[PDB]
């Protein structure tokens, strides 16, 4: 199970832009402490890793981590089992894993001065946000409250420290620039499949509307819904009568219709409630967010699309968290992804 | 040259601690926007990647990136040629690559509030520092001034953007906590060899004094010298008669002596002046820094050690930058590393 044979592997940077400080750089002056004077800074670039099997079959897969994560989540599970990178190289796909701008080996744009500030220009905000262990516990549906596990959980229990250590903050890089970096990657690699997760769900949908090389999307637990501009359906508030899900992203209809041209599958784990759950904010949030996604997929299908929602429990898999690709049954989750790729010929040359 | 057969690969997090916000966490209350209330945050953990060959020989190698870098520099060169990770898995060594705390997939400790601040506790500074392209150009001795190459350069010209894109800031995590994470990794791995670079040179020396499992060190272009406490020799200022090199790190003699028990090699590239060069601050800085390191190695040898300085031009390799392991002749640089490992019995089981 662990052996893997690579025809080649590597990593590279792509995308981003440059910003400049004032003045001129004098090489005879002390270079350290570092100065903005005469400075050119590369910002908002993305890190990309690839592993290619011998004699690949079908399209390369681009695995895109969720919010506050990195490509680590596709490399290994918290308890050290093979991640989807290894499983799909073994399945004879070339596999790209990214650290998007602002995360991991992607660029964090900061300079000499308060965080994110280049002289008088605010590239990203100095004030950050970041989930706690407790927030992530309920966000990812390990259980209804920190320390608790749902019955039949597939979380790798005992490896909580490993799991939460993989998570961190994201600077306020614009989503436009994150999407731009991945569009450039898709141009670089050719026809490919995007496999997204939570926060990258809506970003991957956006990439597909700008990049015809995206030939399919599988989105694990996408966090933000997407609709044609002015056609967002009625979406109820949460059971606490006061909160709402994330404002759906709206794109022009001519771009939205590009989503009807490729196979798209949204995948959800277990323990999303059917009924309002006022006592558990993030469980109720997932209920209404999944509902909004069902309407988004229906809108894609009314325009001639091939969009579907897979609830893992209906496929016979019980207990998955919001990271099904690192849960204890991730091999079975991978099998369902192989099934999708095979159904649409994305595993053939 | 590109193929690699892995018995296993993966990644994991190790080291770090936790800090806590005030108050308690209520799962019924809105979890987003994220709050410090009731929060546990994992901070200062390190990312570790490993690739293991079939039938490994000798000790595992731990590759430790320089300042503002990540394990990318061991994966691939800026122009896409195999890095030392691939070369030494092919040489039948298990290879670990790290993103140290505060870099890449390592943790950047920030919360909900101004960067690095947890309520009124400053975990890392809000004001950052970061090299420009211009500062890094002369730091790494691509040439004497930005945009200019030494005639003999081994840099992969044309891939400047790719190269500079791999560099970024480091938050003010204490060096103690960075050393702590790698000591914990070395305890987990068992006997190994540290391969360090620039800023991680002094940190690897410190790790060796705390971890008998470190059985050898090869340091490329180390940036800070180390001496026994109270025994720093006379080191001249730079040619501008105002600047100094980095204040040498001082450790108790009992720990310093541990450096005499293992083979240690410092490796320097080309274009470091023999004579004072006041027009080019970083060239002169490298002259005096290399001199300080020569005295450091001499001090280890006077304690019965086996500490050597390898200037790559004396081995027939001309024009290397301060990243010899990603230069155009990196295969030849690797050969010299294999020779060190072999001579010292580190390539046998
Ligand atoms: C892995 O888990 C998630 O990925 C994840 C999963 C579920 C919800 C949220 C996230 S997230 O933390 O990244 N945030 C996100 O998708 N975007 C977003 N949108 C708005 C409008 N506000 C905020 O506030 C943070 N975030
Ligand atoms: C994921 O499920 C829970 O999280 C969960 C849910 C409810 C209770 C307990 C757990 S548990 O997992 O902590 N522990 C558990 O189940 N213990 C247990 N021990 C014995 C000795 N026998 C039996 O059952 C016969 N159960
Ligand atoms: C890849 O290049 C290097 O590794 C590298 C190479 C040569 C010099 C500097 C660096 S560095 O930028 O990271 N900084 C470093 O080693 N430590 C350090 N120590 C002091 C006392 N001040 C500062 O200020 C920056 N830094």
Author numbering:
A (entry chain B), B (entry chain A): 12 to 360
What does the paper say about this structure?
To elucidate the catalytic mechanism of SulE, we solved the crystal structures of wild-type SulE in complex with CA, mutant S209A in complex with MM, and mutant S209A/H333A in complex with MM, SM, TM, TrM, EM, BM, and CE in the range of 1.29–1.63 Å. By contrast, the sulfonylurea bridge and the heterocyclic ring of MM was clearly observed and well localized to the active site of S209A/H333A, indicating that MM binds more stably in S209A/H333A than in S209A. Upon binding to SulE, the seven substrates adopted a similar conformation with a bend at the sulfonyl group, making the aromatic ring and heterocycle nearly perpendicular to each other. The side chain of residues Ala234, Phe257, Phe293, Trp296, Trp297 from subunit A and Ile43 from subunit B forms a deep hydrophobic pocket. The aromatic ring is trapped in the pocket and packed by Arg150 and Ala234 from both sides. However, the heterocycle moiety is located outside the pocket and only interacts with residues Ile43 and Phe257. The hydrophilic sulfonyl group is close to the hydrophilic area of the pocket and forms hydrogen bonds with one or both Arg150 and Tyr45. In the six structures of S209A/H333A bound to MM, EM, TrM, CE, SM, and BM, the ester O atom is hydrogen-bonded with the main chain nitrogen atoms of Gly78 and Ala210, forming an oxyanion hole. Superimposition of S209A/H333A-MM and P44R/S209A/H333A-MM complex structures revealed an outward movement of the lid loop from the active pocket. As compared with the MM bound to the S209A/H333A, the phenyl ring moiety of MM is located in a similar position, while the sulfonylurea bridge and heterocycle moiety undergo about 90° rotation, and the heterocycle occupied the position of Tyr45 side chain in apo structure.
SulE, an esterase, which detoxifies a variety of sulfonylurea herbicides through de-esterification, provides an attractive approach to remove environmental sulfonylurea herbicides and develop herbicide-tolerant crops. SulE catalyzes the de-esterification of a variety of sulfonylurea herbicides, such as MM, BM, SM, TM, TrM, EM, and CE, to the corresponding herbicidal-inactive parent acid. The structures show that SulE is a dimer with a lid loop in a domain-swapped β-hairpin covering the active site from the opposing monomer. SulE shows a similar catalytic triad consisting of Ser209, His333, and Glu232 at its active site.
